[PDB]
């Protein structure tokens, strides 16, 4: 989140009226809470799961410009993380097939699974 907000909300960026909504089931710790407070005017956080359609409806995923899925780069099994990310993509495309998705993939042989989704 620190790196993505550092690049995305850079001062030299041209004036863009875009708000960032972080949807995550795990509640933030103190440092994450402080980081969100430093950008309270442009960044909002909500507790929930992508796999639950109600939580997708809460964050207005049907009107969002794009969905960005970040990967856990430090995990015991990269294949499990890749499968979880692919299933999140499947859920998001099931809710709204016309949304634009940018995802992070750990292993190269797993991204072929993304070709199996019709949407």
């Amino acid at each position: 989140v620190s790196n993505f907000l550092k690049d995305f909300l850079h001062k030299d960026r041209d004036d863009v009226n875009v708000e960032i909504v972080f949807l995550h089931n795990i509640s933030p710790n103190l440092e994450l809470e402080a980081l969100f407070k430093r950008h309270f005017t442009q960044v909002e956080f909500y507790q929930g799961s992508v796999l639950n359609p109600h939580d997708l409806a809460r964050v207005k995923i049907e009107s969002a410009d794009a969905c960005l899925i970040l990967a856990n780069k430090y995990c015991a099994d990269p294949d499990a993380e890749d499968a979880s990310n692919i299933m999140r993509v499947i859920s998001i495309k099931n809710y709204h097939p016309k949304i634009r998705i940018i995802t992070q993939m750990l292993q190269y042989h797993n991204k072929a699974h993304l070709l199996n989704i019709p949407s």
Binding site: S49, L51, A80, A83, I86, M87, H113, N116, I117
Partner: protein, 172 residues
């Protein structure tokens, strides 16, 4: 004599109780003879390589794609094979069964399956297209996708990832 009925409502069921005409050398079966039985065979006889499975022609069969590890809970696949090996089916009507999955888990569960006539093993991965093409997945009568890794996960909704990925891979 008790009888079992399928009905929309229980009120019409009572009409069946108040109805009167006036108003209106070799062992081929088990000891009980209810299932097909064969002599026990070692697991080495049923394991097929990819090329060997390619040579044999399988059509109208059953493909069981198993997600299992050497340290996972046992599904108990005998309960899946016993209904398919009952004696009310003739021998020629029996459907060949091919278990595609890890060889360690199938070694663990083979000691309850080695008495059934037509069972074969493909030691591969259900997520690999080469194994599914070797077993002629386009000619099978049914593909059963099972996940032995029923262990608890922090998110329960993520327990079905392997099955959904395999289903989409087979459909695509």
């Amino acid at each position: 004599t008790l009888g079992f009925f399928i009905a929309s409502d229980a009120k019409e069921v009572k009409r069946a109780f108040f109805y009167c005409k006036a108003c209106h050398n070799v062992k081929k079966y088990d000891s009980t003879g209810m299932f097909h039985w064969c002599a026990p065979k070692e697991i080495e006889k049923v394991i097929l390589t990819r090329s060997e499975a390619a040579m044999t022609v399988l059509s109208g069969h059953v493909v069981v794609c198993i997600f299992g590890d050497v340290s996972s809970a046992l599904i108990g696949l005998r309960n899946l094979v016993m209904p398919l090996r009952a004696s009310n089916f003739h021998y020629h009507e029996l459907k060949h069964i091919v278990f595609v999955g890890s060889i360690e888990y199938l070694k663990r569960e083979w000691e309850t399956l080695h008495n059934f006539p037509k069972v074969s093993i493909l030691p591969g991965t259900p997520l690999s297209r080469a194994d599914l093409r070797a077993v002629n997945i386009n000619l099978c009568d049914m593909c059963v996708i099972l996940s032995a890794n029923q262990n608890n996960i922090d998110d329960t909704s993520l327990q079905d990832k392997e099955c959904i990925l395999a289903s989409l891979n087979i459909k695509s």
